[PDB]
From a paper:
Enolase, a ubiquitous enzyme, catalyzes the reversible conversion of 2-phospho­glycerate (2PG) to phospho­enolpyruvate (PEP) in the glycolytic pathway of organisms of all three domains of life. Here we present structural snapshots of Mycobacterium tuberculosis (Mtb) enolase in apo, PEP-bound and two 2PG-bound forms as it catalyzes the conversion of PEP to 2PG. MtEno has a topology similar to other enolase structures, a smaller N-terminal domain and a larger C-terminal domain. The crystal and the cryoEM structures (enzyme in solution, frozen) along with the biochemical studies clearly demonstrate that the functional unit of MtEno is an octamer.
Residue numbers in the entry:
A (entry chain B): 1 to 424
B (entry chain C): 1 to 425, 427
C (entry chain D): 2 to 425
D (entry chain A): 1 to 425
The structure:
Amino acid sequence: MPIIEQVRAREILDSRGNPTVEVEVALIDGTFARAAVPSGASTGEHEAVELRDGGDRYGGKGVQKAVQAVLDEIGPAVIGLNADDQRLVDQALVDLDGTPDKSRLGGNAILGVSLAVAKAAADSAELPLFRYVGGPNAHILPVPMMNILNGGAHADTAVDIQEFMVAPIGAPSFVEALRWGAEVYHALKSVLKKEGLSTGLGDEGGFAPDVAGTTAALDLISRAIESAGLRPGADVALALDAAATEFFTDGTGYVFEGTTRTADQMTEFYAGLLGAYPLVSIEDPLSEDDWDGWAALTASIGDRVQIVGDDIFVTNPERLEEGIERGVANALLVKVNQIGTLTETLDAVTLAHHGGYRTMISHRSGETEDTMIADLAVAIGSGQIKTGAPARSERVAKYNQLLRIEEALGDAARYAGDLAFPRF
Amino acid sequence: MPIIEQVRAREILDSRGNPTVEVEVALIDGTFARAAVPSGASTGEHEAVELRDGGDRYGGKGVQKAVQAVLDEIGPAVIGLNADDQRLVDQALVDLDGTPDKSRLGGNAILGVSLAVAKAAADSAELPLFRYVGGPNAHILPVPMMNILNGGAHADTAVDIQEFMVAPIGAPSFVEALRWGAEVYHALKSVLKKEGLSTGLGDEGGFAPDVAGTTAALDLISRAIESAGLRPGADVALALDAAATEFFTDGTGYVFEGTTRTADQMTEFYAGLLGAYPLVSIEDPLSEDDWDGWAALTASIGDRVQIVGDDIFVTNPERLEEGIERGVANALLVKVNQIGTLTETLDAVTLAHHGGYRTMISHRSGETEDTMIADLAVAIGSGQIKTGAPARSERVAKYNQLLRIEEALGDAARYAGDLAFPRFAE
Amino acid sequence: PIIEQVRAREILDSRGNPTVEVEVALIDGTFARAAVPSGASTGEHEAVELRDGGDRYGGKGVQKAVQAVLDEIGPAVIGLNADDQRLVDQALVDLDGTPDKSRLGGNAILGVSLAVAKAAADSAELPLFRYVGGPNAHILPVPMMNILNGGAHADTAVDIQEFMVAPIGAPSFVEALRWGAEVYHALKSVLKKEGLSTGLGDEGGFAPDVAGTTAALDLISRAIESAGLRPGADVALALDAAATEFFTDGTGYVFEGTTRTADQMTEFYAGLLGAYPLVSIEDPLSEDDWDGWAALTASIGDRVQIVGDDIFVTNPERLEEGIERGVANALLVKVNQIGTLTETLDAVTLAHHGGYRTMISHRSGETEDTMIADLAVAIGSGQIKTGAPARSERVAKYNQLLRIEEALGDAARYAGDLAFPRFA
Amino acid sequence: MPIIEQVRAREILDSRGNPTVEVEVALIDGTFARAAVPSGASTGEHEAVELRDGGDRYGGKGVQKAVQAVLDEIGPAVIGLNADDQRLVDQALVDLDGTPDKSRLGGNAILGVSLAVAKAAADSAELPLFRYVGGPNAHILPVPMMNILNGGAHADTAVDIQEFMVAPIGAPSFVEALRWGAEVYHALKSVLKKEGLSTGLGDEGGFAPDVAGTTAALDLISRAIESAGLRPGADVALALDAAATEFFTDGTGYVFEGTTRTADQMTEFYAGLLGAYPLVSIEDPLSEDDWDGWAALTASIGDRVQIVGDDIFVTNPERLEEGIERGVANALLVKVNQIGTLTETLDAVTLAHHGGYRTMISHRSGETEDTMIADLAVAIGSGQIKTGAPARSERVAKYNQLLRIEEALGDAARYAGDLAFPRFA
Ligand SMILES: O=C(O)[C@@H](CO)OP(=O)(O)O
Ligand SMILES: O=C(O)[C@@H](CO)OP(=O)(O)O
Ligand SMILES: O=C(O)[C@@H](CO)OP(=O)(O)O
Ligand SMILES: O=C(O)[C@@H](CO)OP(=O)(O)O
Ligand SMILES: [Cl-]
Ligand SMILES: [Mg+2]
Ligand SMILES: [Mg+2]
Ligand SMILES: [Mg+2]
Ligand SMILES: [Mg+2]
Ligand SMILES: [Mg+2]
Ligand SMILES: [Mg+2]
Ligand SMILES: [Mg+2]
Ligand SMILES: [Mg+2]
C-alpha cells in the first residue's frame, strides 16, 4: 500500500559545502526513501527559483525556509496521496506553490519531495529506480561525458569555455568506457604536471589550469588520450560546454578569448574547432536568449555536430517548444532542478525525443552523494550523461551506480557508444 | 523474487471461434498472470509466423503444437529468470527459437509467454500494467479509432476498403469520446435500416452492408455523425484502413472499385477523398512492398493527413527504419503479434517516436477477452488506439478497460483529442 | 470476508449500450468485479432494468443505477460478511422495497449481489463454481449454440429467435466445443455457397434472411454433415421461438405468413419434431398463454424438452404456477430476470426438486463477464446457452468452461446426451 | 536468524578515480548491506597490505584479484555464519588469509567483507550502525577536524605539512560545528582569492595554494576564522598533520622547509607553533619508526597539546602497545583499512582507550561515498573525526551522516566540543 504517510526535510551540505535540501518520504507500508537536491553556479535566468534564507548563516545560503515549507505546507498537501501517482503529486506541488517559477515554496523544496516520492514508489514496488521510471524496456548505459578540464564559473581562472569533456564513445561497454575516462583523466594529470600546470581541482573534479585558451586546452586533452594508449575520435572523442551566457553581455556581444564577437563570429570559431578536433557535441555555444544566433549556428554546423541547449531551454517544455519551432539546437540538457518536478522533467524529455532531439542527463556543479541521475539516464534511455570528471565522489558515486545498473541488467545491458553520436 | 516458477499454455477460441494460444505464468511469490494471443485475417507477408497444426481438427487451425512448444521448450528456458527482466526473457525466447520469423516455436507460442511474463511482473510489483510498462509518467488516454463499417477481409461483401473508422477527436475526455463513438455507431445502424442495407456485423463489430464503394460508405457514416447530434470533423472525424496489400497483384497493380490502378492513380483517389471528407488518417493506402509508391504518396499527401504503415512495417524495427529513411508513412500501427515479443514491439515504438512518427496500438481482427492493448496504449502515450466498433466484447472489453484506466488516473488523466492529429484543421 | 467498499461504474455491453459493473472489496484486501447483462426480447414480468432516459446513449444510460449503488446499496451492505449470500440478498431486496426491484433497479441490485459472491470466492481462494456449488460441483454443460440468429436479435424477417446446435455425442466439453465451432464454420461456408448473408446477429450467429424455420434447420443439418458429424447422434438441434415476440393478444400467433392458434403452433412444432433431431424448444408459446403451454406440454413434452423463459422469468412464483399447471419441463435461468443470486438459486431448487431441467442463459446483451460459466457447473444443469462460438462476450464463457474442465481433472463429467433423456 | 547467505564484490572507483573494493552481504532473512574500502596515498610502511592487480588497466591499480578473492575464498568461508558474531567472522577472515599483514587475500578484500557483515547485522536488527556497534550508550558527536588547507602527498605544491585543520571546539552542537567549519572554509577561499593564491582543491577538498611556510598557512587560516566572525582558539582551534615520514630520509633526517633537521629540532619547531597559535593537536610530527624522537617530543610538549600517532601505530595493537610502553604520543588515529578488520580496529581502540590515549577516526585520502566512519566515530565515543574539508562529497557525506545521527539521538546527543581537548586552555 504505497500511500504517503510522512514527509520530512533537513538541511545537509552539497559538494561545495553550501546548504541544500534533503527530503525523506515514508509510506504506510514501511517504505522509506531519501532524495537530495543539487545546486548550480552558472544558472540560467529562466531556471526554477531556488529559495535561499539570506541572513548571516552559511553566507546567506541556508535553506531552513525551504525545509520549513516542506514540513508546514508540502508534507500536508501530499500526505494521503498514492506515491505511484507521480503526475498527481507533481501537479499538487505545482498548484500549491501557485507561481510559474516555483518562487513561493522554492524549486528546491518542491523537487526534493517530487524525487523522494518517485524513489519511495520504486522501493515499494521492489523495482530498481531505472526500471520503475523507464519501465521494463530500460537498458541503455549512457556515454559518460566527463568534464576533466574545468573553466569559467567552476574554477578561479581566466579560461572562457566552462567545460572540456572527453567522451569514450569507442568503448564496448559502460564498465570499459568508465575505465577509459579514468585513464585519460589520470594521463591528463601527468601531462599537466610535466608542463608547468596546476593540478588543483575545480568544482566538478576536472583540472583547473590556466592555459592560453580553447585550443591549448584541447591539445592538452588530445595528448592525454594518446598517453593513455587510446585514439582521439575512434576511442575517445571531445565535447564542450561554452556556457556562453556567462561571457555574453547584452548590447556588447560575446566577450571571448580577447575579442568581443558576434553570434556568427562565435559560429565560425566553433566551425574551425570541428575541422581540427574530433568533437561530438557543443553545449550553450551562444547565450540563453540569442534565439536568432542559435538558429543561424544550428543551420550552419548542426548537421556536423550535436548542439546542446542548456540555459536556452532550462529543462522547460515551453522553452524547448520554441527551440524546436525556431530550429534551435538538436539536443536538450536535462536538469531536474531547472524545472522542479520529475513530471515536468519527463515531459521535457518526451517533447525532445519526439522532436528528433537527443537528451543528456546532467548534474549541477553543486552535487550531493545522491545518485538518482544515473538511474534517470538509464530510465529515459538518453544514451548520454554529464556528471563530472571521474574524481570527487559526488561525481564518482553516479559512475559507480551506472556500474551497478549495468551489472544488474546483465546480458540485456547495452552501451550507447558510437550510436549516441550519428553526426560524428 | 518475481522469479518465474511455472509456464502453462492451453488452446482457447478467439472471437471468430478459431483456436489461439493462452499462457499462464506463475512466480515464486505466488503471482499468477494470463495472456492470450490475437490472430489476423489480412496478415502481411512479413509478419512473424503464426504456428498452426494443420490436419482436420478445427479446419487445420489448431495450436496444440504452439501449446506443446510452451510446455516442452519455452517454459524450461525461462523458469528461474526474473519476470522483471523483460528484455532478457524476450532475447532468450528469440534465441531459443533461432529463426528470424519465429517459425520454429511460433510467434504465437513466443508472444503468449512474453506478454504473460510482463503481466506477472506488473502484478508482483503491484502496479497496473499501463504504469508498469509506461512508468509513472503514463497518463494519455488514446483517441479510439472505431471501425464501424467493415469490408475487405473482415466480411463477405464486395467492399474493397477494409475499415471505415470514426475518430471522436473533439471530445473532452475518454469517457465522453467512447459515448460519442457508441452514439454514432447506433445512429449508423438506424441509417442502414432506413436505407434497407444489412446491419449484420463483420469481424470487428462494424456493420457489413454491401455498399457500392468508398464514397457511399463515407456518406452513410457522415449521416450517422449528424444524426447523433455531432459535427463531422470538429467533433467526429474519419479514418480508413484500405489494407491495400489485399487488393494488390504484383506488376498488375491495385484492383480497386472495378478497375486496375497504379500507385499514382491510388494516390489521386485518396487525395480526392481528403478534399471531400474530414479524414485524419489513412492506413495501408498502398501495398506492403510498394516502397516507390508509398514514398510518392507520402510526399504527395503526407503533410495533409496521417499515413499509417501496417503490413509495410509489420511492427518490425528493421522495416520501420527503412520506412523512416525512404520517407514512407508518418505513423506506425503497433501490433505485438506481428513481431512476437513485447521488447521488439517497444523497440519499434521508440524508433517511431524518436523518428517523428506517431503510433496507433492495434487489435487483430481475431481478438480475445484479453485487454492488454488498452493498458499498452496508455503505457506508450500513443494517443491513438484501434480496437473495433463499440460492439462485440472482444472490442468493447478494451474500451471498458480504458474507462477503468482513466478512472484510476483521476485528475492526471489526459485525452489526446485533436492534438493526436495536428495535420487536420471541422 | 467483511465487506469494506462497494463501487459501481457504467461500462458498455456487447451491442455498445451502457450497463452496470460493480466492484466489491473486503477487509482482507480481496477485490472482485461483476457486470450486468441486458436482454432485447425481455419478458413483461422480468425484474425492472433502470435506465436514465434523456439524450445520453439514446436514453440507455445507467448513471442512476450506478448512483443507487454508491448512495444506498453500498452503505447497506458495508460491514456484512460477503459469505452470507442469503443475508446480503435479503438486505438488497429489503432496501429496494418493491416486488420488481423498480426503486433501485434490478441492474443496480444484481451487480452487488454477484460481486459479493465473486469476492467471497476469491477470499476463500476458490473458483466461483466451487464456492457456490461446493465440493460436489463437477458437471460440464452441453453448450447450446445459437449459430443462426433471427427475431429480435437481428434485422431480418426470420420469426424464430434462435437456431441452436447441441453437441450431445461429444465425449467431453473440450471436444463438444470444437464440434460446435466446426459446425459453425461449416455453416458459414454453406451460407456463402447459397449466396446468403454471413453478417452476425447479436449473439454471434449468422443472420441470413432465410425463407423460414425449415430452410434454417436444413442449412444447419447440412453444416453438421459438412463438418463430418451425424445430426442427432453427434449434434442435435434446439430452438428458442421467443413466441411472445410474434404473439399479439386477441389476434394470435403471427407466424411465417399466417395467423395461428396455440394449437396450430403446437402442430407446427410436432411437425418439426418428426422431421428433425430436435432436443429442446424454448418459449414455443407466449409469456401468459398458460392454457396453450399446458396443451402443448401434454402434447409434445414427452418427446422433447420444453423450456420456459419469458413465461417463468427466473421467478419462483411464476415457476411454481407452471409446475402446478403442467407448463413446460425446463426452466431457463437468467440471473438478471430476477435480480439476485439467492433468488436465482431458489428458482433452480424449485425446478430441480420438481424434476424440471435447467439451462443457464446469457442475455443478448452480454459483457466480458464469465460468471454464468461457473454458475452452470455450480448448479449441475448439464445445459448452458451463451451464444454462437463467435464474439468474445459469448466465447469468453466457453473459454472459462475449458479452464473449469481442466481444473476439475478426473472429477469432470460432460453431461452429453444424459441432459436430453427424451431424445432417441 | 541473521545468517550470512551470499557475499558479492565489485570493482568501483574511489574519489581520485582509482579502483577500490565494494562488497555486498545478503542474509537469509532478506537483509542486503553494502560497504566500500578506502585507500591512502601517504601509506605507512607497516599498514595491512593493499592487493593491487598491476599491469596495464587503471595504471596498475585494479582490484579484480581482491574482488575474485572475495568470490573464490572469503564468500564460502563466511556463508553459514551468524552476521552478529563480528569476532567469529573477523577471526575466520584473518585465519583464512593466514598472513600477518593480509598479503595473501588483501586487506582491501578482507575489510570490505568485515564491514559489509557489520552493516548487514545492523540492518537485520533494524538499528543504525553507530548503535549496533556502539550499543545503547553510543551518543557523542565528534569534533570535526577539517583539513581546509591541503599539502604534502595530497596536492602538487611545495607545502611540507600534509594537513592544516580547523576544529570548531566552541560550537554548542555538531550541527553548529559543521556550519562553523563550512563558514571558515568559505572565508578561507575569499582570503586566498584576495591574495591571488590558488583555490584549486587537493585530494581532501582543502585548498592547495603554494604558500611560503607553515606559519604563512596558519596566518591565512587565522584570518579566515576571524573573517567568519569566529574567535580563534575559543570558537575554532587549529590542528596539524605533518605526515613527517613523507619528508624523512633514514640517515639524513627531517627535510623540512629547506633544512635537514633532527627529531629535537623539529620539536623545537612544534613548540614554537604552540606558543604563537591556538593548536589542540599535532599528528605524525615525526617518522613512522623514529621511536626516540617521539619519546622526547612527547616529553617535551605532550602535556600542552594532543600528539597523534598515525604512520607510527597504523591502527595496530602491537605497534601501539609499544608506543604506550615507550611513552610515545598521546593519541591514536584510527583507520580501519590500516589493520583490515572491524574487530582488530575495536581492539586497537580499546588498547588506546583503557591506556589513557585519545582516538580520532580517520578517512583515507582516497575515499568513497561510504559513510561508515561517521557511525564508527559515534559508536566508539571518540569525540574526534578527521574526514576532510567541507567540500567534495566523499568528505561531505560523512558530515551529512553525522547530522542525521545527531538528529536520531535527539536529546541523548552530546557534542564533544571543548572536552575532547583538555590540554588546550
Ligand atoms: O552548466 C552546466 O551544465 C552545469 C553542470 O556542469 O553547471 P551549473 O550547475 O553550475 O550550471
Ligand atoms: O489490418 C489490420 O490492421 C487488422 C486490425 O483491424 O486486421 P487484421 O488483424 O485482420 O490484420
Ligand atoms: O431470449 C433469450 O433467451 C435471450 C438470450 O438468448 O435473449 P434476450 O437476452 O434478448 O432475452
Ligand atoms: O595521512 C592521513 O592521515 C590520511 C588522511 O588525511 O591520508 P592518507 O590516506 O593518504 O594516508
Ligand atoms: Cl441473406
Ligand atoms: Mg550552468
Ligand atoms: Mg551548461
Ligand atoms: Mg491487416
Ligand atoms: Mg491494417
Ligand atoms: Mg428474450
Ligand atoms: Mg428466450
Ligand atoms: Mg597518510
Ligand atoms: Mg596521517
